[PDB]
Amino acid sequence: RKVDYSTFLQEVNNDQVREARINGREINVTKKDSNRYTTYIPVQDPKLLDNLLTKNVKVVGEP
Amino acid sequence: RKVDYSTFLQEVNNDQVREARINGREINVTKKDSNRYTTYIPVQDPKLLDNLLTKNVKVVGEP
Amino acid sequence: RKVDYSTFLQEVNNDQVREARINGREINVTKKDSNRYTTYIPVQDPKLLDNLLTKNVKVVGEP
Amino acid sequence: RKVDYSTFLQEVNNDQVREARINGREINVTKKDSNRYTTYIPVQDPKLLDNLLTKNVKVVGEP
Amino acid sequence: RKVDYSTFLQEVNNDQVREARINGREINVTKKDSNRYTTYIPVQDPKLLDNLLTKNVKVVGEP
Amino acid sequence: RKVDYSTFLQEVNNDQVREARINGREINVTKKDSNRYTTYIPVQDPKLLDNLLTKNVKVVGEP
């Protein structure tokens, strides 16, 4: 399932996000209700990481 | 249809924009009146995402 | 015809610039007096886009 | 052993980190208790270096 | 002739520089006394352009 | 001989550094006591150049 980046950030800051598996521009997201989806980073977002960390999201990268 | 980046940002600032499908420098735009056009990012714009999000534009990226 | 980047920015902020067709580092410029020339971005300039937009320059990118 | 980036930064902030061997996005980490693990940088983090240095972490890069 | 980047910036700051022909990391420099030399950008310098422009240096890029 | 980046910066700001020959991520360092070594930039460091220049370090780049 695919979700819009803006919606994803909305969920991040609405404290609904548990984990974010970032793979290049691809982010595999797990919600706090265990729902899983994939979203893509549209353009370089320097504010992304700090946003995830400030909202206590589990952040993971891939080989 | 193709539209200039500056004009596109103007429309973003006048809330005529519903969605922005960003694919590299190519942005496929859908207006609130359901109209379609294409604009290109001229140079890297760090303020782009912030602008789209502040104006509640649905932002989506592509694989 | 080719013009120095510094001169180009001078013209941009002296309100003499109508349009800027950016193609990578290549900028195709049209003056308000319809004179046309080409200038090149020497190094990455994060202040460029905002400068063009603040001076109401038509900004266009290429495929 | 592999550890999540956010958790890794948490440990950096709790001074449990002695060394950080950065190799691209791969960081080989040695804790103050001599423990070893690997973490990956999820997206470009401009605050990473500053964070490591503020917490007196030995930072090393590889050829 | 080759000159160190720091020294080059010093000359820029002492207004001994007339032109700076930037070609990637290579800068071909012409002093106000018509003298020629070459300097290389050591790492990406976001302050370079701003420095050249503040000191009224003619800045040019190459295809 | 190879030295940790953090240690290198420590030396830079302890005014022990005379010259820095940067070659990509590779920095060839000469101390004020004529000792020479090689260190590597671990991740992009935007604060590096300004740091070297503020501490009056000879900064040189390579072709």
Spatial contact of E13 and E55, defined as CB atoms under 8 Å apart = yes
Record the resolution, in angstroms.
Answer: 2.5
> Do the beta carbons of residue F17 and residue F57 sit within 8 Å?
yes
Technique behind this structure? X-ray
Between CA F54 and CA F17 the distance in angstroms is: 12
Q: CA end-to-end span of chain F, whole Å?
A: 23
- DSSP code, position F55: T
Both tokens of C45, joined, read 């300039």
In angstroms, the Cα distances linking F21 to A11, C48, D8, E5, F61 are 47, 31, 32, 10, 6
CB atoms within 10 A of CB E36: 11
Residue B43: closest C-alpha in chain A: A43
Give the DSSP letter string of F4-52: -HHHHHHHHHTT-EEEEEEETTEEEEEETTS-EEEEE--S--TTHHHHH
Determine the distance from the C-alpha atom of residue C35 to the mean position of all C-alpha atoms in its chain, rounded to a whole number: 13
Record the tokens describing residue E4, joined without a space.
């160190």
Gap between the Cα atoms of E24 and E26, Å rounded: 5
Joined tokens for residue A55: 């909202």
**How would you list the strands of the sheet with F26-31, edge to edge?**
F36-40, F26-31, F17-23, F58-61
Q: Which of C10, E25, B24, E61 is CA-nearest to residue F63?
A: E25
The torsion angles phi and psi of B29, rounded to 5 degrees, stand at: -110, 140
C-alpha gyration radius of chain E: 10
Tell me the C-alpha distance between B34 and F14, whole Å.
Answer: 62
Residues of D at the F interface (Cβ-Cβ below 8 Å)?
Answer: 20, 22, 41, 44-46, 48-50, 52-53, 57-63
Q: Which residue of D has its CA nearest to F42?
A: D61
Our measurement of the distance from residue A27's CA atom to the centroid of its chain's CA atoms, rounded to an integer in Å, reads 6
Contacts of B58 in chain A (CB under 8 A): 4, 6-7
User: Domains (ranges, CATH) in chain C?
Assistant: 1-63 (3.30.720.210)
Beta-carbon contacts of residue E34 (< 8 Å; ≥ 6 apart): E18
Rounded CA gap, F51 and F56, in Å? 9
Q: Helix, strand, or coil here: E34?
A: coil
Give CA separation, A60 vs C4, C22, C44, D43, F48, in Å: 46, 37, 31, 10, 28
Amino acid symbol at E24: G
- Neighbouring residues of B35: CB distance < 8 A, sequence distance ≥ 6: none
Strands C58-61 and D36-40: unpaired
Rounded Cα–Cα distance for residues B27 and B23 (Å): 6
Q: Please, which residues bridge with residue F20 across strands?
A: F29, F59
Q: From CA D31, how far away is CA D37, in angstroms rounded?
A: 8
Q: Is the CB of residue B30 less than 8 Å from the CB of residue B19? A: yes
Integer Cα distance of E40 and E63 in angstroms: 18
Are D59 and F25 a contacting pair at CB < 8 A? no
SS3 of D12, please? helix
Q: Who's near C59: CB < 8 A, 6+ residues apart?
A: B4, B5, B6, B42, C19, C20, C22, C49, C52, C53
In three-state secondary structure terms, E10 is helix
Determine whether B2 is exposed, middle or buried from the number of CB atoms within 10 Å of its CB (0-12, 13-18, 19+).
exposed
**Residue environment code for B25-62, b if the CB has 16+ CB neighbours within 10 A, otherwise e:** bebebbeeeeeeeebbbbbebeebbeebbebebbbbbe
**How many H-runs (helices) and E-runs (strands) does chain A carry?**
2, 4
Residue carrying structure tokens 């510094």: C6
User: Which residues in B1-63 belong to E strands, given as ranges?
Assistant: 17-23, 26-31, 36-40, 58-61
Distance CA F53, CA C23 (A): 34
Contact predicate E6/F57, CB 8 Å: yes
Continuous segment of H or E residues that includes residue E29: strand E26-31
Considering only alpha carbons, which residue of chain D is nearest residue F4? D60
Give D22 to chain F, closest Cα distance, Å. 6
* Pairing relationship of beta strands A58-61 and B17-23 according to DSSP bridges: unpaired
User: 3-class DSSP state for residue D19?
Assistant: strand
As given in the structure block, the two tokens for residue D63 are 């050829």
